[PDB]
Design a protein around this ligand. Structure first.
Ligand code: GDU
Ligand code: GDU
Ligand code: UDP
Ligand code: CA
Ligand code: CA
Ligand code: CL
Ligand code: CL
Ligand code: CL
Ligand code: CL
Ligand code: CL
Ligand code: CL
Ligand code: MN
Ligand code: NA
Lengths: 537, 521
């Protein structure tokens, strides 16, 4: 006579949301798809001080999901829409700290009063991609445990050290934990943003988000107060990094903007789509339509091989997320060309070239890569495009890419700089000393020896200069042909074949675009280096 | 870095209490629930009362007012009118409308427990006395989905069946008596448990249990405990009963045409059964039971023989008599062991020549002497005061249910019929059981007394007291439980009766017996 399985533990998900409408469709979409039984899950949502339609998005989602969960608590407040003592929407004044602390205490009291086993705090911009995160956190059997969320930088939802006054302290252990070099659940003095409290443990009764502990003497900060509360309760905060759990945006400054926040979370979605499928939104919420543009450029090109469908879709998704429209140029497959078609185009390798690394001659793929860029150069001159931006099909976008690239071009044109080529993504080779800065143009340098063609801006003058050199009779890899044309290539023999090397080439500083996969990374694809010489099979 | 985790809090249990016409039992029943050794912050109360002819809701609300702050939550669902079901024949009749309402109530408590995320729901009938404060913990420890504690009763009845007739009817199996008697201890799979039981709402199969409506496949009678039992079978939830130790007591259900007073006295007998081997079940700190006032049951006097060194027997008997509203005159027993031979000779006491123990052939003991002298002094007092009818008690006896009413009705019938009587056994050891004792015509529940072997309790008339004294039994001392059978000429040893010339005692016995011994040696 067997006893049935136990039901899953009872969890209350507590969600405080202020100015989160940009993130809720994806964040709430992740939460609703958690692999934890919904009848064993309850929802506690509090929103207030919203300058956007956060209240409406939450209400639309709650009405659609209410009948699926154990219970829903909904605490909206439409007015006021900003704190009276705030300096901005991203400023954390004492009134904001006190209110947030009281909300988490209210959510904790709710979880206790409803006899829940756990309360799960998730910040409205924290994306829990792993549906097993809640189950995994429960399995660790801790009183307070947080999953380590990834960010674009070293930031994460934990500290490895804390001073005697509650300030952050960096320890050597932080980096290996952050990079998942050491995997496990580590005792840390601080966790926040997303963490799990075990309300079955007797010691959890002594935890409080508000008021501060009677012996508290530190700053009126919400996460420090709770950390000190676990200290007095003798409750050890833990962070677990045993696998990927989710992603979170790096917090902004007090004087930042709501657009900075919205674009920052968009970068989280971009970072997810680097090595994961896109994080889908909730099927009960619709994100607002986006209007793509060309960022003021005359044209935006995207070189993509017709067979690389995965790259095309990832790039088209990334560009649509950033409201950027491109012209999809079908790349020239160098492997598909036979020797006769190469001769039909009159293509001859530069006499004596060898790969700077393994010494192999020009490959068929490198030939096609050069031809695709060359064809875009012709189209720039044919259409008379003053400024055009060229993309490859495997690049990772930096945060605030669109605004930062538009601001750079605006500064370039305002100073009347005579430019031919502007690197957006490259491999800088002169690293012993900084490259020469461009006067009166911030974030721009004179390009020294470089070695990539991920992304760049090209002028009509610069397009003519490349075609004028007629590189087809002396073809090099395009990422080496350019440093020849602005006279930075180390091999003097290569530059000797090119009589005029007057190209004006610059680079963004810091770079705005990096490769998605590097050599040796899982999934790295280099159709240029397919070990196939251009001359013949 | 090892860091210990604090203990887990106790499981969260909702105690569901349905109360109708239960004011007589609540002060003791609710007091037992208070003192359950389980954290009250992990306990919730669900109480529903309705169709009350007594002050049940008043008693309940005063108790809840006094304990509300100690519990996780309290739900209160009273309904003053109507005070009786429109289809009921009486307050103890289980009509279909009463069955339906009680099923819906238990379903409401079950839904309430699920909605508050309790671990367990414990049902306790308002008349069930959970004397063992660890009962809740022990039931949780068995890790069953539906488990009930075997509560004790005055009879074979308990809160469980061992067999079922595939049509919902009760069925007797050979395993019932061993479980009921605690000859076999443990937790046993059974087709039916009721009254007080514990449901484990952590188990996945508990989601399919339902008190109402009946399961779609239900084809049996509209009975509440059958419907829930069938719900467990369809959910593949095995019902269990545990008897590993004593947990509590419950009255035996009455008949449809019984009265509220019948129920009140029935639960009072439950308290008597508790006091046999336990201290009296204490009431609530906040509820007081109504004061009782004892009488002499219409007798001219009620005696109770007790030796002063037997303080426990004295206190237990007085508690038993007070509960039954019976007042008595305490008579200090003669301690025959303390009597020296000089005091024995001063009273002219001589054993009946040739007496031998019917089981060990031993002479008359000093203890039997003192016991005889105790009854002898009462007979003497009966004749001095002229008491027409007196009731005589010893100090180690267990009372039957409805004792007071059952004895007073017999005496009324005896007087109505003008029966000439000297001795009426209220408790004895019937030795002639091969053929039935001759019934007394026109007097119900009374028979002619044949050979008997005890003197636990008897009614004696002034005429009867005169006859016993006239025999001069001190010169022919014989155990009192044998001297009486000699006097109504039913003693087997004709040589013993030869020493007594006149043996004209009119003896009768109540049938069935209203008083039995406690240890029943
Ligand atoms: O008035 C408010 C203020 C904030 N929030 C909510 O509180 C969470 C945190 O707000 P932010 O997303 O702006 O937080 P940051 O990215 O700036 O980093 C945060 O990291 C910790 C998270 O616990 C602390 O809350 C810290 O104060 C805070 O800066 C969010 O779910 C937000 O929606 C509200 O609901 N109402
Ligand atoms: O209208 C009503 C009728 C009954 N009850 C309650 O339900 C329980 C039934 O106990 P009773 O003493 O009144 O009835 P029984 O002694 O006959 O014992 C009962 O034991 C089972 C308990 O599961 C079933 O209720 C069954 O119908 C019945 O025999 C009690 O707690 C009673 O207070 C109510 O609350 N409201
Ligand atoms: O024969 C080829 C191979 C690639 N490409 C394109 O040129 C760029 C080179 O990217 P890839 O990652 O394949 O080469 P690598 O970055 O390794 O030099 C991409 O836009 C490709 O679509 C091309 O035009 N012809
Ligand atoms: Ca945030
Ligand atoms: Ca009952
Ligand atoms: Cl709602
Ligand atoms: Cl990093
Ligand atoms: Cl920090
Ligand atoms: Cl009848
Ligand atoms: Cl009738
Ligand atoms: Cl009848
Ligand atoms: Mn590449
Ligand atoms: Na009748």
């Amino acid at each position: 006579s067997p006893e049935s399985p136990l039901q899953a533990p009872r969890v209350l998900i507590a969600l405080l949301a202020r100015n989160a409408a940009h993130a809720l469709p994806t964040t709430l979409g992740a939460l609703e798809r958690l692999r934890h039984p919904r009848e064993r899950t309850a929802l506690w949502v509090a929103t207030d001080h919203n300058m956007d339609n956060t209240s409406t998005v939450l209400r639309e989602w709650l009405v659609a999901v209410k009948s699926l969960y154990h219970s829903v608590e909904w605490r909206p407040a439409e007015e006021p829409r900003s704190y009276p003592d705030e300096e901005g929407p991203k400023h954390w004044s004492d009134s904001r700290y006190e209110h947030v602390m009281k909300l988490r205490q209210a959510a904790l009291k709710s979880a206790r009063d409803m006899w829940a086993d756990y309360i799960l705090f998730v910040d409205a911009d924290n994306l829990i991609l792993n549906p097993d995160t809640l189950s995994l956190l429960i399995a660790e059997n801790k009183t307070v445990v947080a999953p380590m969320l990834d960010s674009r930088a070293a930031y994460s939802n934990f500290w490895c050290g804390m001073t005697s006054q509650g300030y952050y302290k960096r320890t050597p252990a932080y980096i290996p934990i952050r990079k998942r070099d050491r995997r496990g659940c580590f005792a840390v003095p601080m966790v926040h943003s997303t963490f799990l409290i075990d309300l079955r443990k007797a010691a959890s009764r002594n935890l409080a988000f508000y008021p501060p502990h009677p012996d508290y003497t530190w700053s009126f900060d919400d996460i420090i107060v709770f950390a000190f509360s676990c200290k007095q309760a003798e409750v050890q905060m833990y962070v677990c990094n045993k696998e990927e759990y989710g992603f979170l945006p790096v917090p902004l400054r007090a004087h930042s903007t709501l657009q900075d926040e919205a674009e920052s979370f968009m970068h989280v979605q971009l970072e997810v789509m680097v090595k994961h499928p896109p994080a889908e939104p909730s099927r009960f919420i619709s994100a607002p339509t986006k209007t793509p543009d060309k960022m003021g450029f005359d044209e935006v090109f995207m070189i993509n091989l017709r067979r690389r469908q995965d790259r095309r879709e990832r790039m088209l998704r990334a560009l649509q997320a950033q409201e950027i429209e491109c012209r999809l140029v079908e790349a020239v497959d160098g492997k598909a060309m036979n020797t006769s078609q190469v001769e039909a185009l009159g293509i001859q390798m530069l006499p004596g070239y060898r790969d700077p690394y393994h010494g192999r001659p020009l490959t068929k793929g490198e030939l096609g890569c050069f031809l695709s860029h060359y064809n875009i150069w012709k189209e720039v001159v044919d259409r008379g495009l003053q400024k055009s931006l060229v993309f490859e099909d495997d690049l990772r976008f930096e945060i605030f890419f669109k605004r930062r690239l538009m601001n750079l071009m605006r500064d370039v044109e305002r100073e009347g700089l005579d430019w031919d080529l502007i690197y957006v993504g490259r491999k800088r080779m002169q690293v012993e000393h900084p490259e020469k800065a461009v006067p009166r143009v911030r974030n721009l340098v004179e390009a020294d020896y470089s070695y990539w063609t991920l992304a760049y801006v090209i002028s009509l003058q610069g397009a003519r200069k490349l075609l004028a050199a007629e590189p087809l009779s002396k073809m090099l890899p395009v990422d080496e042909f350019l440093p020849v044309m602005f006279d930075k290539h180390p091999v003097s023999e290569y530059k000797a074949h090119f009589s005029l090397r007057n190209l004006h080439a610059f680079s963004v500083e810091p770079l705005l675009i990096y490769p998605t996969h590097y050599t040796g990374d899982d999934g790295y694809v280099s159709d240029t280096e397919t070990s196939v010489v251009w001359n013949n099979e």
